[PDB]
A paper describes a structure:
p-Hydroxymandelate oxidase (Hmo) is a flavin mononucleotide (FMN)-dependent enzyme that oxidizes mandelate to benzoylformate. Its Y128F single mutant unexpectedly shows a new reactivity and is able to oxidize mandelate to benzoate via benzoylformate, a four-electron oxidation reaction that is typically catalysed by a monooxygenase. In this report, both biochemical and structural measures were exploited in an attempt to address how a single O atom dictates the oxidation level in the reactions catalyzed by wild-type Hmo and its Y128F mutant. The present structural and biochemical elucidation nonetheless strengthens the idea that the FMN cofactor is versatile and cooperates with the active-site residues and substrates in dictating the oxidation cascade.
The Y128C mutant (in which the bulky phenyl group is replaced by a sulfhydryl group) that can transform (S)-mandelate to benzoate was used to assess the extent of active-site perturbation. The structure of the Y128C mutant crystallized and soaked with (S)-mandelate revealed that the sulfhydryl (SH) group of the Y128C mutant has been oxidized to a sulfenyl group (S-OH), in contrast to the other sulfhydryl groups, which are not changed [Fig. 3(i)].
Numbering used by the authors:
A (entry chain A), B (entry chain A), C (entry chain A), D (entry chain A): 3 to 182, 206 to 357
Write the structure that this text describes.
Amino acid sequence: YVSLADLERAARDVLPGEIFDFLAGGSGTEASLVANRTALERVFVIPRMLRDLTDVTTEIDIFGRRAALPMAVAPVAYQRLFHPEGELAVARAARDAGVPYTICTLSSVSLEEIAAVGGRPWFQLCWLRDEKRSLDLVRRAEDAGCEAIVFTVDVPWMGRRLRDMRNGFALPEWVTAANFFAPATWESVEAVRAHTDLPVVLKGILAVEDARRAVDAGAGGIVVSNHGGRQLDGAVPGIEMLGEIVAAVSGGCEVLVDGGIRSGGDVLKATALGASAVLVGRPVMWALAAAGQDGVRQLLELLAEEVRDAMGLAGCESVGAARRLNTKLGVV
Amino acid sequence: YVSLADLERAARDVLPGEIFDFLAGGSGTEASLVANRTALERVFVIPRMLRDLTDVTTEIDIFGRRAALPMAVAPVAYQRLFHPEGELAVARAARDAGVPYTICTLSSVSLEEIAAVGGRPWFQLCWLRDEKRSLDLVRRAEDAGCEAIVFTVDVPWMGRRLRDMRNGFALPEWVTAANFFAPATWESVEAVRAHTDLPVVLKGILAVEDARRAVDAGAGGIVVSNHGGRQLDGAVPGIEMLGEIVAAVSGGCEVLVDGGIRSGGDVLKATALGASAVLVGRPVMWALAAAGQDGVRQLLELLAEEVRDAMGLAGCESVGAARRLNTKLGVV
Amino acid sequence: YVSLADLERAARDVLPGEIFDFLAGGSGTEASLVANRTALERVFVIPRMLRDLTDVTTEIDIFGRRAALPMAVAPVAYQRLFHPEGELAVARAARDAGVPYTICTLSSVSLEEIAAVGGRPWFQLCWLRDEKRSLDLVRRAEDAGCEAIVFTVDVPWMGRRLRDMRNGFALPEWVTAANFFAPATWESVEAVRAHTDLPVVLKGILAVEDARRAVDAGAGGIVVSNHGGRQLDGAVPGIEMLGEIVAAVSGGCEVLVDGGIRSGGDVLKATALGASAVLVGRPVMWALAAAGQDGVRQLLELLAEEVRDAMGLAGCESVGAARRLNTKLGVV
Amino acid sequence: YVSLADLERAARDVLPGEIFDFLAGGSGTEASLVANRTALERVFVIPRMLRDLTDVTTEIDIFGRRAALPMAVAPVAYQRLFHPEGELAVARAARDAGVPYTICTLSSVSLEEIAAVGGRPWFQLCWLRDEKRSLDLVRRAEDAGCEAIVFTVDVPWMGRRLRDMRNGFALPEWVTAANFFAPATWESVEAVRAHTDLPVVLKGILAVEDARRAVDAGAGGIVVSNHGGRQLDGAVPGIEMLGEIVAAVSGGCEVLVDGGIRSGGDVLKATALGASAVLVGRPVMWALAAAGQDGVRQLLELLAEEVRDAMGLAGCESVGAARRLNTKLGVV
Ligand SMILES: Cc1cc2nc3c(=O)[nH]c(=O)nc-3n(C[C@H](O)[C@H](O)[C@H](O)COP(=O)(O)O)c2cc1C
Ligand SMILES: Cc1cc2nc3c(=O)[nH]c(=O)nc-3n(C[C@H](O)[C@H](O)[C@H](O)COP(=O)(O)O)c2cc1C
Ligand SMILES: Cc1cc2nc3c(=O)[nH]c(=O)nc-3n(C[C@H](O)[C@H](O)[C@H](O)COP(=O)(O)O)c2cc1C
Ligand SMILES: Cc1cc2nc3c(=O)[nH]c(=O)nc-3n(C[C@H](O)[C@H](O)[C@H](O)COP(=O)(O)O)c2cc1C
Ligand SMILES: O=C(O)C(=O)c1ccccc1
Ligand SMILES: O=C(O)C(=O)c1ccccc1
Ligand SMILES: O=C(O)C(=O)c1ccccc1
Ligand SMILES: O=C(O)C(=O)c1ccccc1
């Protein structure tokens, strides 16, 4: 594979149609899904030349750990839908690549099993029925060695995925929520923050004042995100809010972004707009569906090469230098 | 049906071509018809997270009545063109859904019959030949229990609908104006205002100074509208003037908008731009053509679900909160 | 015919391909040809409502004559290419419609014959070899009763029309320049101005300072124009410069525009941007090719109806009112 | 041939697919390749009228030599890929046309042989392994009569060309680097500047501060360029940075641009945005592939005619006048 798009076509061949649709789809008319790509494609980088590139490194420090790339695997529920080894295959490849892996509340393998793979994983939280049960998941994750709590804050309930409705899609018998909901509020965030010493990362922030409030609330990071266009149809892409949010936060927390990152060049664009790091969702599942653990390994090796390539061509010996790049909006 | 677009395809199958064209078409090159959709698609919402959604309500108070949604059925003449029960089917479904229904001057069932359905209806006025006859329609409507007069102000005469011309379209023998024209002016508006205690709503305002003058003239509301692209071809979409008009009116009257509203997400966009409520026209007729009263019921139930979904995903427990959402223009 | 586009299709059937290409084509990649349409389509009118329309008139006074519409027939050379009656057919229809007709220097019927048709015609000048011969054409035109000199100022030489090159197109034996070149300069303009009491109109102005200089030079009007995309490929559309030019001239001369005017709605857009009047070129030749004099009559009757329709729907009882309309740029 | 596009189609027929792909392709998704064209197409010229065109000249003085056009042949490696006479054919045609030719470090004919053709050539430098060897190439070029050193500064390494990867493309046995790499830095530039009295031209500048630093570093010129979209995928087109860079440099060095120049009209656009001259790459190779030396001659004759045509139609008797033209961005 020489691009991430090679993997999508590979995954479309192997996966049952309704499972491919569950993976690919968005809510409503899929306007926000498409806009995630359109918005990235409008961004152009202004590269710098003639800088010292003797020691180009793509590494970052985030949430107390060195990562090999400014990237983590996004939370994607029920990964056994895509391959029999599910989350274990993905976590093993992420570990080997030096990339953080986000364990889901709705993982199809238990969080303790996935954490035992190693690789200093993160844990994504869905707010439950009950403050007490929510906090027990958090404590489980922490006890198992997870290093950050990625609190999903854009799912008071799940969006209307019309492909799934039309397909009559439901979980197969053989896929379960192996770790086993009410709308989260700022009170929920405070309950989590008080219950753990781990950094709390709020995933799904788009409004500038919600980013500011996240810092005020003691968040260690946010993910600027419209949930891959799967939640509010018509929600602005995260990439379009990122610059404004980075300015408003003024270094008070890590600012990640996701939605449609499909190459090292896209990672460079996100960094140039001010992101600390990106999450990548669907492409990791394409790789998993296509070729299991080895597929995810190949994807991460490709992304690593593309990120190094893009950084050097843009005159950046470090991710910090890439954040100081300027950009220009074009038309496509 | 899981989207409004499902209903358009259903209606295209059942309706005679020339009747579908009468319904779907615009004036001239249909530039303003298409622009109504293009303009909505360019609007993106910036949703808020982590707000209290224990008691989400889509209700509003408007013109002295509670409505179940920030939506009314737009005036559409001659509804027996689309189904034998015509206006009665639509008014019954609107009543049952808690949605105001606008009775037309050119209704194919008499306004008194439609009003007897109940549901606290509105009445749309075409200015007639004669101040005295115009005012008699208004008095009839008021006597029959209509709760607002929706004065159409963008039809000094009807626009040039080229589909209708090419089709040689005319009313069938079996469809008549059951309630049985000169250009309206500001004098006409004053005559109506002096003749009724009902709120007068001016439908078809696009210029900011006409919105201001509407308030000065004693209007209780306006509908920011290019008449679904059926009047001046090249008229700006209402959705593109809405923000400016809401600012200029500064709460002096209700500001509604119509043109291309095709989902709860579109309703959210209109509200975020400052609308009090929307009108929906063609989709209600698609539902009527497809399945009569039950079709319109299903459409309104779908819209209700989509509006609740969109509001909650955007962190809005009330329509007032949705009006305080910010937006960002994108490219499509 | 119910639109101008009906006539283009009619003309494509009857005309030899290479003659249709001579008519339709532009220079280079035809970027400026296409941009004339794209630019008009981006303009939206903000119509006014509820104004007195008891005496709507589309008439204007220009260059000392009343015209029935804010429109004249553009200069198009060699009209016998399109119909055997050529310029006589077009001039007769223009006369009957009350529309000025521009007689070309390269007319295929002599200017005296065309002037004898009546209808108070204009005369378009190509600068010749020789100040003396150029001025003799001007004097001929004036002696024959022409009422304005339309000096073409954007043709120091003719543009590169690649359709014509590829077709190997040349004038048929049966078409000649019946009135029988060097680049014009500001000196040429002064020579013409000193030689006639007729208003001199400079056709092909796009730069704001050239519009200002035209007024300083004693021009009675200008046509803001890129010559229908037939001269510099990449020249900005006139419609995109019109507002700026109207502001700069501040009433010092008439400001006309041409390029892609294809409906009464387009005329309204041009007027709302500040034009005194428009020229229409290719559509008049479509009508001529399709049905001779009667074709041109039908075209002008259609345009008259569309202009009246658009003005009234926009609340304008006069062309002066239409010039005070505001506009908004959209996306298409 | 009547356009440059005629030559691309001619070249596609004759060349092996993988060689055509090597020539045509870009890096990554080819976003920057496409954007070079999209950006030029958005630029419109505001032409001037009625100026003296008695002595229109397309000549410029640059780097101490008169050139017949504001254009040079871009450096393109390995020209024997496209025709057996390779660089000699192109250099002979450039000489005969009065156009500078850029001899490549990776030329498939030795730089001394190509220089012996005459025509006062330029030499493009790839920074080598070794300051000493790099400087020896420079001295060779200077000794052979090259008149400028075009230091490529946007290739710390080569970009990822996916067409080449997918094709498994490599140099044929019969093509070699007849003159026979480390990332260049500002230190490398200074080493070159100190080693030659020839003007040093930095090719591949996009950031305004890199243009400023180039002047500070003693560069005689820069080429504002994203390397034809072959290096960083997502790099802004040079044409989009050109105006800002010309303002920042304030006459301190020559500012050239390349990327997608495909007509004399495009040359005019570049000049109107402030360029001293353009480079043309792929079209010269199309002409070479299509018809060898005579093909390149025909291409340069066509470009000369198109540049003269465009300048005169825009009222410019000299390239300096063309630089004073204004432009307007449109939509396409
Ligand atoms: C199939 C699927 C399942 C997902 N499950 C979750 C989830 O459980 N929790 C969460 O916060 N986000 C979830 N997401 C959202 C992703 O974390 C991510 O925000 C989104 O996919 C955008 O990134 P992408 O374009 O790289 O896929 C899911 C996305 C997909 C496609
Ligand atoms: C078939 C049809 C008939 C209409 N009749 C009327 C009418 O009698 N009075 C009026 O004010 N608007 C009338 N309208 C305009 C609508 O009230 C509304 O402004 C327009 O359809 C835009 O909304 P939509 O895109 O939701 O259809 C009509 C529209 C249609 C399509
Ligand atoms: C076939 C043809 C011949 C023309 N001949 C002339 C001419 O002789 N003099 C002139 O000033 N313009 C000439 N024009 C330009 C037109 O007057 C006008 O500026 C142009 O066609 C743009 O208007 P349109 O889009 O309505 O055709 C010609 C245009 C065409 C298509
Ligand atoms: C096949 C090919 C080989 C090239 N080789 C070089 C090179 O050796 N050195 C260099 O500085 N640029 C090289 N370039 C870049 C060109 O000089 C030029 O910047 C680019 O092609 C953009 O111009 P165009 O759109 O006119 O082709 C090459 C381009 C192509 C297509
Ligand atoms: O988060 C999601 O987008 C998603 O599709 C999902 C669906 C079911 C359970 C958890 C997440
Ligand atoms: O209002 C309309 O758009 C419309 O189409 C119409 C047609 C006839 C009578 C009333 C309204
Ligand atoms: O003016 C023109 O555009 C044109 O096509 C023309 C061609 C020959 C003679 C006069 C005008
Ligand atoms: O510069 C280039 O773009 C290019 O394609 C190339 C490839 C091999 C050697 C030198 C240049």
